[PDB]
Every structure is written in structure tokens, then in C-alpha cells.
Design a protein around this motif. Structure first.
Motif, PDB file in Angstrom:
ATOM      1  N   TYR A  27      53.223  -0.101   7.737  1.00  0.00           N
ATOM      2  CA  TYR A  27      52.873   0.001   6.207  1.00  0.00           C
ATOM      3  C   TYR A  27      51.227  -0.258   6.044  1.00  0.00           C
ATOM      4  O   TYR A  27      51.054  -1.274   6.391  1.00  0.00           O
ATOM      5  N   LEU A  28      50.732   0.517   5.101  1.00  0.00           N
ATOM      6  CA  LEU A  28      49.558   0.233   4.736  1.00  0.00           C
ATOM      7  C   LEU A  28      49.508  -0.860   3.741  1.00  0.00           C
ATOM      8  O   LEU A  28      50.670  -0.852   3.016  1.00  0.00           O
ATOM      9  N   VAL A  29      48.747  -1.714   3.763  1.00  0.00           N
ATOM     10  CA  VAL A  29      48.761  -2.970   2.927  1.00  0.00           C
ATOM     11  C   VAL A  29      47.285  -2.937   2.072  1.00  0.00           C
ATOM     12  O   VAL A  29      46.335  -2.761   2.810  1.00  0.00           O
ATOM     13  N   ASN A  30      47.520  -3.260   0.725  1.00  0.00           N
ATOM     14  CA  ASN A  30      46.177  -3.379   0.094  1.00  0.00           C
ATOM     15  C   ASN A  30      45.717  -4.752   0.534  1.00  0.00           C
ATOM     16  O   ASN A  30      46.175  -5.822   0.302  1.00  0.00           O
ATOM     17  N   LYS A  31      44.320  -4.871   0.936  1.00  0.00           N
ATOM     18  CA  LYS A  31      43.804  -6.034   1.368  1.00  0.00           C
ATOM     19  C   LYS A  31      43.573  -7.241   0.306  1.00  0.00           C
ATOM     20  O   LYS A  31      43.320  -8.287   0.713  1.00  0.00           O
ATOM     21  N   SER A  32      43.617  -6.480  -0.887  1.00  0.00           N
ATOM     22  CA  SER A  32      43.365  -7.566  -2.025  1.00  0.00           C
ATOM     23  C   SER A  32      44.668  -8.064  -2.544  1.00  0.00           C
ATOM     24  O   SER A  32      44.559  -9.323  -3.030  1.00  0.00           O
ATOM     25  N   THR A  33      45.456  -7.395  -2.708  1.00  0.00           N
ATOM     26  CA  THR A  33      46.931  -7.976  -3.071  1.00  0.00           C
ATOM     27  C   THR A  33      47.902  -8.325  -2.054  1.00  0.00           C
ATOM     28  O   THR A  33      48.526  -9.141  -2.206  1.00  0.00           O
ATOM     29  N   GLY A  34      47.598  -7.595  -0.847  1.00  0.00           N
ATOM     30  CA  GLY A  34      48.601  -7.780   0.061  1.00  0.00           C
ATOM     31  C   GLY A  34      50.072  -7.035   0.024  1.00  0.00           C
ATOM     32  O   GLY A  34      50.828  -7.195   0.647  1.00  0.00           O
ATOM     33  N   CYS A  35      50.066  -6.034  -1.124  1.00  0.00           N
ATOM     34  CA  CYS A  35      51.096  -5.212  -1.221  1.00  0.00           C
ATOM     35  C   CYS A  35      50.922  -3.867  -0.598  1.00  0.00           C
ATOM     36  O   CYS A  35      49.870  -3.378  -0.549  1.00  0.00           O
ATOM     37  N   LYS A  36      52.022  -3.335  -0.376  1.00  0.00           N
ATOM     38  CA  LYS A  36      52.221  -1.754   0.082  1.00  0.00           C
ATOM     39  C   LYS A  36      51.758  -1.104  -0.935  1.00  0.00           C
ATOM     40  O   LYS A  36      51.484  -1.235  -1.996  1.00  0.00           O
ATOM     41  N   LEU A  62      50.145  -9.174   5.196  1.00  0.00           N
ATOM     42  CA  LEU A  62      48.938  -9.770   5.541  1.00  0.00           C
ATOM     43  C   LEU A  62      49.232 -11.501   5.694  1.00  0.00           C
ATOM     44  O   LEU A  62      50.007 -11.869   5.268  1.00  0.00           O
ATOM     45  N   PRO A  63      48.719 -11.892   6.883  1.00  0.00           N
ATOM     46  CA  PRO A  63      49.129 -13.165   7.419  1.00  0.00           C
ATOM     47  C   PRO A  63      48.746 -14.437   6.303  1.00  0.00           C
ATOM     48  O   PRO A  63      49.324 -15.367   6.401  1.00  0.00           O
ATOM     49  N   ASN A  64      47.863 -13.918   5.332  1.00  0.00           N
ATOM     50  CA  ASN A  64      47.506 -14.919   4.410  1.00  0.00           C
ATOM     51  C   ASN A  64      47.599 -14.371   2.985  1.00  0.00           C
ATOM     52  O   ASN A  64      46.832 -15.040   2.139  1.00  0.00           O
ATOM     53  N   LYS A  65      48.108 -13.426   2.704  1.00  0.00           N
ATOM     54  CA  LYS A  65      47.870 -12.672   1.394  1.00  0.00           C
ATOM     55  C   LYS A  65      49.597 -12.246   1.213  1.00  0.00           C
ATOM     56  O   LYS A  65      49.782 -10.901   1.641  1.00  0.00           O
ATOM     57  N   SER A  66      50.174 -12.740   0.624  1.00  0.00           N
ATOM     58  CA  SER A  66      51.752 -12.845   0.350  1.00  0.00           C
ATOM     59  C   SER A  66      52.035 -11.789  -0.774  1.00  0.00           C
ATOM     60  O   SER A  66      51.179 -11.596  -2.029  1.00  0.00           O
TER      61      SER A  66
END
Length: 66
Positions: free
Chosen positions: A4-13, A60-64
Motif C-alpha cells: 500500500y502507498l503510504v502518505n509520508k506525512s500522515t503515515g496513512c494509506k 511507516l516505522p515511525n509514523k502511525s
């Protein structure tokens, strides 16, 4: 790889309504910053295949976001 693509700023799909073939996900997955080869909507979230190791996938390992 794929996932799944993940938004780098929110960590959401990235969400998508139209399941299956989805030009919306295909486009986002193909963006040069993502570098994927093909995308489609799966379980209401953009799935990307052919992604390079360097591109992160959900989560993201640090962005839940869960």
C-alpha cells in the motif's frame, strides 16, 4: 516489491472507492517519487506493484495511522 502507498506525512494509506482497476491508484503508484510499475485499488486503498526497495509501503516505522 509491492504494498500500500503510504502518505509520508500522515503515515496513512491513500483511499479509493472504485475497486479493481483504478487509474487513480495507477497514476499515484507510477509517480516518479513512488516509482512503481502498476497500481490498483484493493480493500479501499491504493496498492502498488514494482516499487523499488527505496520506496516505503504502509506502515511507516515511525509514523502511525492505526
Amino acid at each position: 516489491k509491492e504494498g500500500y502507498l503510504v502518505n509520508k506525512s500522515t503515515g496513512c494509506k491513500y483511499g479509493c472507492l472504485k475497486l479493481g482497476e483504478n487509474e487513480g491508484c495507477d497514476k499515484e503508484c507510477k509517480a516518479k517519487n513512488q516509482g512503481g510499475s502498476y497500481g490498483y485499488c484493493y480493500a479501499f486503498a491504493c496498492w502498488c506493484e514494482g516499487l523499488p526497495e527505496s520506496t516505503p509501503t504502509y506502515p511507516l516505522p515511525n509514523k502511525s495511522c492505526s
